[PDB]
């Protein structure tokens, strides 16, 4: 029973914690990052931020 | 490609020179750095003009306008 | 254009007076943005001047 209750649940997305970007509907710096090459070649790397207290998310590039 | 008269940068005239440059190279077997120097290239800019030539008229002189192939 | 992905046009040209020298009285043949270097990471164009 207890092993059929742990296999039913879902994957967690634990992204990586970090504390410098400001998030900006509950200003709680526990905002999780994800950075990529992404846009063209022509401009440097794309970086996108959410945070994980409210659910915010926003782009800097 | 003849040498340049000039010096692109400072107005100097480096074009004379060539051909006591290249007399210290093998006759007096010097390097490159005191054989530009002795010629009173100080600068690095007609260094730049000196150093870097490629002399493309010795190949041109063995040939006529007439009758290339491909 | 250089052998690093950095091309650009000519937009002015200047005369040796107007050009900034050096305490040596060198004279730049051109002169580029430095906005043009950190975006594209092109360090081996700064190690190769």
Sequence with gaps: ?61 | ?70 | ASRHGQKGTIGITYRREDMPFTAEGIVPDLIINPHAIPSRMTVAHLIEC
């Design chain 2, 1 to 70: 490609m003849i040498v340049p008269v000039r010096c692109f940068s400072c107005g100097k005239v480096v074009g004379d020179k060539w051909e006591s440059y290249l007399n210290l190279l093998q006759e007096d077997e010097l390097d490159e750095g005191t054989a530009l120097s002795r010629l009173g290239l100080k600068r690095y800019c007609c260094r730049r003009m000196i150093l870097t030539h490629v002399d493309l008229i010795e190949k041109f002189l063995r040939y006529n306008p007439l009758e290339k192939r491909d």
């Design chain 1, 1 to 61: 029973a207890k092993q059929n209750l742990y296999n039913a649940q879902g994957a967690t997305i634990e992204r990586s914690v970090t504390d410098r970007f400001t998030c900006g509907k509950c200003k709680e710096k526990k905002v999780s990052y994800y950075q990529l090459q992404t846009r063209s070649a022509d401009e440097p790397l794309t970086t996108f931020c959410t945070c994980e207290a409210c659910g915010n998310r926003w782009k800097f590039s």
